[PDB]
Subunit: 70 residues, 2 copies
């Protein structure tokens, strides 16, 4: 956020439209998502905080598959 | 949606502000959430479709605890 670019774009910064999340992790506490990109094979990790707001519908859709209500 | 009220309000219709989801299930395919209500002990189930749009931030927050990335 402060200066993710500077030389190379990453995640949403890349500009690529998020098709559907296909990954999840965490840097050191905050959750993460390996967001997918339209017409782009190579994806990119995006902070859970950024995804769960810029793409609420998308992130929510992802959980559906990787749920665990049992 | 067609006429949930008619005589008695349920879920978001009640008007109560959703504090934090504390439940999840499914009628017959579509996921569900036992949405909580501000200054209200008695909660109420709300369709996943309604919650994952009217309260994206809330629903997303709920998954955080009930995750399963492993």
């Amino acid at each position: 956020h402060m200066k993710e670019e500077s030389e190379k774009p990453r995640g949403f910064a890349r500009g690529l439209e998020p098709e559907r999340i296909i990954g999840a992790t965490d840097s050191s506490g905050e959750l993460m998502f390996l967001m997918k990109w339209k017409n782009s094979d190579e994806a990119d990790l995006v902070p859970a905080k950024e995804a769960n707001v810029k793409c609420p519908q998308v992130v929510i859709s992802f959980y559906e598959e990787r749920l665990t209500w049992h």
